[PDB]
Amino acid sequence: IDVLLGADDGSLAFVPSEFSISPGEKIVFKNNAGFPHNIVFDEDSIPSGVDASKISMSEEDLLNAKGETFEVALSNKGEYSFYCSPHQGAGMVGKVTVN
């Protein structure tokens, strides 16, 4: 599943921001507009026992180029909340459910 980092109108949003996937399904987060961006899973809002560092950028890491991606596949079932650190208060957040 492809997720844009920044909308095509420049909005600071993940597109889509809420979605569901199955285990091992690739998520490709792709810099689109308004970069740098990152994608950080909130360590307090992911499934039991999951290591956020296996699945996340750090808050200091950035994707700096249009078209640059961060790929991750999730395995454990449940809800995962994530955000772009520099744009979180602007609303650049999302939630993926693994079912």
Q: Provide the annotated active-site residues.
A: 37, 84, 87, 92
Is 43 annotated to bind a ligand? Reply is no
Interatomic CA distance for residues 56 and 38, integer angstroms:
9
Cα–Cα distance list, 76 to 25, 45, 49, 50 (Å): 11, 13, 9, 7
Interatomic CA distance for residues 15 and 11, integer angstroms:
10
Site residue total, Cu ion (CB under 5 A):
4
Nearer to Cu ion, 9 or 24 (CB): 9
Stretch in the footprint of Cu ion (CB under 5 A) among 33-41, 46-54, 56-64, 66-74 = 33-41
Stretch in the footprint of Cu ion (CB under 5 A) among 16-24, 50-58, 65-73, 76-84 = 76-84
Give contact residues for Cu ion (rule: CB under 5 A).
37, 84, 87, 92
